[model samples]
Target chain A: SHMTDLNIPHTHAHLVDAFQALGIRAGQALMLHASVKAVGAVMGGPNVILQALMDALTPDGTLMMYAGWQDIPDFIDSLPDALKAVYLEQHPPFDPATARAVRENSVLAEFLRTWPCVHRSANPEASMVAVGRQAALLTANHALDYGYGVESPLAKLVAIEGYVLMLGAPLDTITLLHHAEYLAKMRHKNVVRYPCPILRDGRKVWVTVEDYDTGDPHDDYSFEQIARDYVAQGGGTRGKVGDADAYLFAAQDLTRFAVQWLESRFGDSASY
Target chain B: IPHTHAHLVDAFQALGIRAGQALMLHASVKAVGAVMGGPNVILQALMDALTPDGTLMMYAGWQDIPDFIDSLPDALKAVYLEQHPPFDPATARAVRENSVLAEFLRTWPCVHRSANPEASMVAVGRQAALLTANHALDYGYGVESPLAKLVAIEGYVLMLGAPLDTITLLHHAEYLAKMRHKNVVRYPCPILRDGRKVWVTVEDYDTGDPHDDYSFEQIARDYVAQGGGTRGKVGDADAYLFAAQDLTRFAVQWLESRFGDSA
Candidate 1:
């Protein structure tokens, strides 16, 4: 008798309509950074949302997300140095088949990365996964150093003239900012070095990885300011999907704008 | 007004750079005043000062590296990208516009250059083979590169008319330091691997840039305070000389105390 009192139902059909309103088009490639809580209560949670997104884009569009290694911190910190080296050499090679999704990203990314048709890059630290038409091309040959630079999926996104969908996610979560940071000429850029275990000739080998400093405890090249500038320049389109605030941006335009924006902020010699 | 090879030899001896010791130099030809034979004399002096039993090395990086093109405007980038030449170690020594002395030293017969395209080291002397072999290194400045070999051989880094920041031996310490906030840099570079031009990613620490991260000046100052290095005049330029092992050991402790370990 108590179950008779039901509220208005939100279904997969509703999500498809919401995505269309937010300018998601068929045959278009999308890199999604999302937050499930921002979408409020859904009919079937993340599964329904993924289904709706796929249906809206049809079979032609590709959906990608950053799926950095979930166990990176564990391997990097837990073991002693000598032991760590040994562990890396003997560790299970990163099998995308069983490896879990990155912890920080949303549940939606967790599902998408494991989707049957999805393809994952070989990079152990800053790996990315894609599903749909451009999956293989986007996920191939991810360089060890510049994970978000020209050789990574991020660059492929720009090359394809794709879109970035920030579904209830904050500007800081936008992974494309790393690509802009890579392209932007700064006066003093920071570099980071760490050891990682990667598959080489079907065996795990410990290799030191050097990469651009993404962020650290002291300083964060936060995206709030640049993102504000991006939206103000009319380069972003905003709409509602479920209860989430959805924003879509043309990848190339945003990256180019970020280049100028960063240069102006840091001058030519912005290094902290 | 020109200083001769003998003058440099005297300066090297005064600075405690003795024979049978491996040496790495960072010199500013302009700051060295007028050399007797220009930059070539400085190169000859380094070789003569160190003797045939001693090894001398210099950082011989490719000058026209494509990574610098990241800062160029889009309009200019197109032209620069198309015209940029692939990295050939033999020719890279020719374009050492950043350091003319390094260029001169790199072409000297029997001088061995490391296989690493970006952070190659050019060396000549008895220890050249040991320092330069197996140098397609993973970590550009770590255990495998010539820098670490310099430390292993109890090498000396001599600054001839060059500033303390140019003391690249500190980079060896950087690799050994157990600091959590170590800075890394990644960029795109072209390498002539196996007779083909492959755009490889160059990943290493921010060693060249002497800004806030990994303070070389601070490290050098501490080394001086700790009485780890010897200071004297190398030419017209003031020079600081330190044992690679002493500096590397001190830096490991200094960085760990200052920045703390990742643990």
Candidate 2:
């Protein structure tokens, strides 16, 4: 009744074919950053999108994503003293086993976080979850201080030579750049301290943790800027995944390249 | 006139919703007919009517549950038994058959969900945790289930523009029905115990055709005939609200009267 244009409601088969065409192979680890909205008109609901990935991954491959706490208080320092005191005193602490992934980051992340048998890191503020063969290996050591630093899931992903799948998500969603931020020998990097509750000795405690996360402290450059530069420099795989232009990059090479880029722009002895 | 959030809120308050009330809701978005901003507007309006202290609940049964796996041949069943993913309460999808609103609430921030894969309950607001926790894997509509807990906590059942047959509260009453026509079924579904997948056999009453015939429609009709529940308009659609205990009690008696010896 309505065939005015090219219309094939994307199915699991179509999704799998798209993923394969985009260079995804069996048994390789992938960090998925997807914007499901960009995948116009799936045959079924959004669940098909995930099933296709898992099918493409073929059980041996691992899929990881950032799943920060849903209930993590934002801009606590900006609160008025009385309200801040009341909030800090009364807010429920982040519980790894029970807390949901922050929905604003990605519904896909929340979906993965709630998935059965997925391993989630214990970090309250900078948590990550993974499933498949390398899940435990990737997320087992998510560090609290300098959360994206050495021994973190991002670092582990790079170590294991995993690929970051940017499936219709924006470039700024690149979390690996935070790892580069941590590794860069740049001068005057900003460090932020925030209070979060965590289970200490089986009781909730308000603990302050330090992070390199103020959205952007990279000499006023954004993660989007870094990712665009990296992608334009030409080695990352680029193709369409479900009607949206997508990307796949070697996490190790991207991090290594971004480290030099960050140092060059913000390093000691650079202009300004 | 299209219904806005405030318009829906006004209707809900007029329908006897008050701040601090615990409400288990069954809603039909389309039944509300024309509304601005989609079904989420309906959710927001109800939460607004209920306010900061109230809890909102909906039955969010798992999507794609492999109940038919048991009917498969030996080889296929074995393959499914070994390979199908375990049902995680948090990750499981709400059945679209339940209501489109069910899934939205299930994924809403700060919501707690019951562990029963087939009859999981989603709750948000003050008593969300209390209403959803410790839902029995077996007898999912009975004794220790969220339905029972809702009654115990003295919640209200809001039938917002939904059909009379869509009332799930009657299923809770089905468990308490003194009739001898109960059909018990046990099925296996996977779940995580200590982070490992284990197939757990859940025992519960078989719903719909398995039990002696009766309609949530008939039960609700007779109850409303006796002047039970408040009747009103939500948008352009007819709405009803009943005390959970009153509805369950009435439905239980109604079932026993009809199917008591219909064996």
Candidate 3:
């Protein structure tokens, strides 16, 4: 493609202005899902995006994201015991300080993981990263048991009344919906169990954790459908951050609405 | 601000880089300044200039290298020796202090990396495997090292808008230089071998501040003044390209003459 095809030559200053216009406010705790390709080119690479967001949000605000471990055998369910045997002995325990964020989830996530003064949660499979005022608080209590439930960072984001931002990210990319899944009254929700590796005190420990299945919780509803509906009902602010379409949504309002949506659609499966 | 692939190609070619040449690179992304497509465009341009048969290499040491494990207090050292996870090349991040572009090359498709955590090298293209395979952890920058191998294959070093002191290749010359009291150090670092973590004691010529009242910058400056390399502009950065063999030969002689304090 020609350079003229994409509107770039953008700088950190330009991105700061764009983010502010996209409803990112000073002192707001916000989660982000951004695509570098969608944002197009900015001076100083995508490092400028982090700089711009920080500038727009100010030092008082907090930044958060789902930057899960770079290497998780999520596909092990399909493999036989033999195929998973090598990793049982060889896989290194998740070192929160050194573990890289899963690249497929987001490339910027690794950048965020290495950010100065960043804090990362200890949940191996459902880890999160944050920086700024609420960085430690929100990330400090992520329960290994229900990685996405009340003890998870996502729950704290909602409790603190934060907002979620999506920059040219898919509608289904809103991870806060998983918290609603954990709370849903809906029966027949898929489940998964796995032994996650972690360092405790002074040793590498492989402990177990269980949670609602990945991809989707309800067989009948996709996260994309729920997010699309939530936005249609005036639940989010829509705008642009660079060449990408962007959004801002209130965390509590959306999660609560999702909980209700799930309970209303599919009631208890345990019928007397 | 619009440093596109086309622009980079022209600049790189003018710097005497041609198709199918094996080149080692040290770059400053910020020095190249604002680009049309950001960091990825730099790789794209370099690949286009070198083509499929050409090779590109960079020094990409491990981000999680435990260089200080040996220096920690005995209480803390014992704890780390037992607990710290071993370094896995597949997941280890490139040291950001060297350059963020190092990480970009590390994660680039089909890229190969040497196993040395402190002084590992990353390469992509035709010579990737040959250069990265069987990397000796001890004396990593010296004999049989990737730097030595590059010189053998007649490779070139690219200083892309980088400082004179950033040439990691010169560490190889330090090993060849005859001198009294050559600085050396040994440290234990954990790495996964087969199925278990092992704390391997490694050795190297102390590449840091190798001599008193002298610096790597001085060597590079003298080499440039003596016409040991070609110089030109690559984008907004002052770029230099040196034949690996010639540059090392000069440094070996220079080190011998300056500090020939030997038996």
Candidate 4:
């Protein structure tokens, strides 16, 4: 199932040029999800990708990425039942200023989040970071509950009519689509509960965080169909960026289209 | 573009307003621009679209009721109470005047008005009696009202030159869901009690408060997002048509998911 690799070195200038050609225009507010490996060998790796993305967007435009804390595994199933409490209590306080990026979330997300002048939301469970003109506004006042819904930075992007950029990332990497799930007209029966370290009275304490669950296999639904149907409806512009597949979707149109799709596929009459 | 009676029939047909289907309309005459034969012609066009058996319903909110006078200054409140009109079904129907089309539809032959004093509804056609009979005035948007009956019969909601917030079917959903933080409003109004005008307290959800955080726009967006309705143009105005069953079912599920106490 493995594909042959292309070890050609890709430079920041090449990526910047490729991004512009792939419709990442200047002065646009973009939330990007990337896979560094998919782009092959790069001169400076994630740093170059971040520079290229920001360069194409320019200082006038904003760039955002999901920079959720990786102190522990994202899902409870990834840890043993007996070790849940032990790990939760031992985890370091989720400080956006110094917390490292989630390994599975790609090295670019980590670099971009800690980049100078980048503003990160205060949400510990699913924090996101942004830079440029709209960074302060987008990263401010992120609600604890419903981290992926209207309360989070993701919804802020959709509210401002932003764009979602998938750079060498799969279509399912689109986190904004999860926000649409929160907006869809259907019954949600699942809840995700996890423990995280948060600042309490200027000290770190382990606290339980509960939020709506994403489509798990047990739930019998996958976000991949959302992308497939959205693309079928002509909801995005797809092209290549430096030998890596790229997709750009307007927030408004994708949310609207995905909302409809989720409702029809998983609405009232459908079983949980 | 100005619409004549003939033009309206064409427009309604093009918008898929079919015969023998019960329909509730929320319309704005000014938003529709100009009409050749005035408000009466517009009513005539709606009647023609649902001719023979289909029923037509419109909200007949009492315009002369002094319910909100309680919130005014004592001097202003006394003046409003003294001028408030009695709750007479026929008289209210003729002078409701909230919407131009409502004024005309109430007077149409064999039209039956609901018994609710402050939030009465008027309907015309074969199922008029069934739709508007013995409506619960206190909780006018719930199971005992025509709004619920519309869902029972799988009626259609037509928004003619009106915004998506005008959908009354969502009110039925709000009442049905009974979510936490459901706001209730109560006010006094005059109604006929054995041929004598008496004050009665009306209690229901605060659906009319514009500043309330609860938004029908979000629900409407969800409805449209699910491909639950049809949209097109009728004359110079944009129109939206949706089934009562689809709207209520979707809205109930949506409210439960978004605001229900348990996920």
Candidate 5:
């Protein structure tokens, strides 16, 4: 919650080192499918995390985010009937069911292209990186089945590869999780298979995926049944139900490696 | 890669598919074999003769019936299909690897299926493959090619089980219609039933099961009962009726209004 210059650069170093170790390099396109919260936690909070990511992606590497305008829509809809005015003051209200653009030069819009903000990635294959959860502000254009409208910042960043420094998270928090699901549904649901949607210039969308958990431990019926197990084990996710941390990584890595890694981690519970 | 061959043989032995009869199959791979059999021998078997090309396909939906029930009031729990156990990864993998299940699930590029609403990974290929493959020639109502023909069918396709109360056919039809038109939806399916590894598909708009146990008639009724329909949910009509067999009367009258007496 507090910002210090030391932690800021330190956070940047962590992200850079992680990306470098992951084999990211100059001239190699990068998109930050990252979460500011995870970055903040790893770097001690928002300002530091933001500062660190900005430092790591300086010069040529691209940086993007899901500033969460769609969140505004849902958040507004959820405002208490009596406090509706106060809720709007906190954040611009949104009509979750309407066709209006999800952004409005709000705080989210500022995050999309300002200081830490930068150019949208230009590479073609870089689209995948745009599909993770934290990068909603960046990948909305290319992502398929996000709950909110397409063309948010997240849609623009699909298909990129780079250092994804998650604050502390999982694949589902990344938009890629849902992207994987979206691809599958296009087949089953028989929907139009557009490679991309026409985005409305600005708006941020948080992305996620659906995954499976197989238990060699033998599963119980309710969350209460396996919940204690999850609490005790301190491993495994309650998946769609319970909230969990997510990370930022290149769309390529998340799609190619991380997804598989998450799947294999299931051991017996390993279903993607 | 266990090569799915052994798993297929094992499942076929279980189903006792003696050549004829149709089956509505649901599968979890762990329920099928020991490990993920690559290329899924069972999926290959479904492509064989007897019930070729036309009458296959299973309810490969990514279900969250339990979660939906849990989210509702205790009063609503009574209507939920008996709570089955939670499905974990082994079962998810079972659905996935048991054959071309993954391939069938990721049946995109041209179709983009892995996560569509009604016909997600589990609904379309993996589940059906696991069922047909394990049963060999016995149970499972699947045609030869899982993709080329089945997903492309036109109009309404119904699934008649012991109960239609929770079937959510309207939602399935909506997903089918969307996939028919290729719109995207995402949501998580609470894994039910025990099986091997398999894929789960959740799309937006289709929280898999948007609201608990809502059929068209029920949705229509609730729409009015809550008065969302009258206040502003719809235009003029307040209610539409559905009583299963009696739906014919409604359809005939409705269709005639749009078409002609012959319709």
Candidate 6:
């Protein structure tokens, strides 16, 4: 209903266009992550993309987004003293009334509130992407650290026959690759409390960052480069004005980017 | 019948009767609700409560929010500090004048607790309790607040301008009764005043919000983190009424629970 007021396009058109551009087939699972402006421009804006994603991911496909409450200030105030006094000492002050006022009454909130199923992880830096048949991920999470791999929402989608598509953006935007990096480092590691929101036993806590930077996307450099070097690397080619391509990362080559790079620097440590 | 509770007003009135008495009346803001006048009005009422030369003291704690969390051990992940960065001269001044908060004039330092920026609150001497009695939104998150601990320590905890129904004295009592394991302490708290960051320790709590263990603290912390203080007001904003001996009772409970003395 609110989308009608904002002149957002029908969701079908946007999803169809993205799938067409990326040359993706129906029934393919997609781990879609995107920024509002970039995704909207190529897919015909929020309304089209959101509706499209929903329409595309119908009965079988999944739709989700990342909602991490850590960066927020009220997150600090609510901690009981033992935790609040110790861990949240460095938190920034935040106001919820303002967020509510802006999101509830504002057009942005009305327009975007319908998107669903954001993946949330316990790792402070851990991430779960916003994926759906139609929408793009808006928020940041630790999982985005994987530049692109199985641990990455992108790779997960790809495993299910999904493809990576970008409209107009740089590499850093594709957080999947970053998530892969986070996973590589965090496997079987000791817990080092960094600031995080932990939910257990029907309660939540601002937990410490374990030894792992659960949120770090190790392939930050590669992830950023993935989008830019698409054409050069023979991943995809761009056509005339505004025309872009979705580069399918070959699984065999996926390791070349995800882990092999660590060979030179990490030496024996990069064995995994 | 104007929705103005009488307990706090009565407390301040009683305080005024003993004008010039060196009274350190600690208050729980939740104790005061929408009275005849709001926070500012009730503060003015407290001005009529204390006598001149009777110094009023309240805590302006909220410094070193950064280091406070970082100080946690590796097992316990530290949460971020979410209040105003504990500094802002103009904000502090506004709190004192516009609200029922005392602008403590002193600052101090300590090691175990957060830092504080104090004010040697100057208000109508009798009305000093007025400042202490009514503060709904002016304390915590933004204002320099040690009110909870300060009041619990004072023993004569007052909730002026509202009802016994709206008091937070139970929390105050819990702070003392539970955290008495340590002596008064202090720590460096980083604050931003007038946009400049500074380190100041006003008054120290023996321990921070010492009600439960770290795990339970996490639950409350995460709930507030995901939610926010405004949520706290809405969700946990009911006033409390604990007798004077409640602290002693709480102390006994706290000792048994924490030490497992059972006796």
DockQ of each candidate, alpha-carbon based: 0.01, 0.11, 0.03, 0.00, 0.01, 0.01
Each candidate: what lDDT? 0.76, 0.83, 0.82, 0.76, 0.31, 0.36
- Worst ten in a row by lDDT for model 1 chain B: B89-98
Please report how far candidate 6 places residue A15 from its true position, in Å.
5.3
lDDT tens digits, residue span A124-185, model 5:
11222221234334443432233212322332334444333333443323443333233221
Top candidate, metric lDDT? 2
Better of 4 and 6 by lDDT: 4
Candidate 3 TM-score on chain B: 0.96
TM-score of chain B of 1: 0.88
lDDT by residue for model 3 (A6-114), tens: 3234656667888898788999999988898998865435666876898788999999989987656454446678645544544556777656677776788887876
Docking class of 2: incorrect
Q: Any runs in candidate 2 off by more than 4 Å, and if so which?
A: A1-8, A270-272, B1-58, B62-92, B95-167, B170-245, B249-263
Docking class of 1: incorrect
Q: What would the per-residue lDDT of candidate 6 be over residues A161-207, giving only the tens digit for each residue?
A: 44444433354545445434443543242233434544455454554
DockQ result, candidate 5 = 0.01
Q: Candidate 3 DockQ category? A: incorrect
* lDDT for position B47 in model 2: 90
Q: Predicted candidate 4: interface RMSD? A: 37.9
Q: Report the CA-based lDDT of candidate 3 relative to the real structure.
A: 0.82
The stretch of ten residues in a row with the least summed lDDT in candidate 6 chain B is B104-113
Task: Evaluate residue A208 in candidate 3 and report its C-alpha lDDT on the 0 to 100 scale.
Answer: 72
For residue A37, model 4's alpha carbon misses the true position, in angstroms, by 1.5
Q: Candidate 2 chain B: minimum summed lDDT over ten consecutive residues — where?
A: B34-43
**Cα lDDT, model 1, residue A76:** 49
Model 6 stretches with alpha carbons more than 4 Å out? A1-15, A39-45, A70-125, A129-161, A182-192, A214-222, A226-231, A236-256, A262-272, B1-263
Q: What residue pairs clash in candidate 1, if any at all?
A: A187-A269, A191-B183, A191-B184, A191-B185, A192-B183, A192-B184
Model 6 residue B192 lDDT?
60
RMSD (Cα, Å) for all candidates, in order, is 24.5, 9.4, 17.8, 29.2, 25.6, 23.9
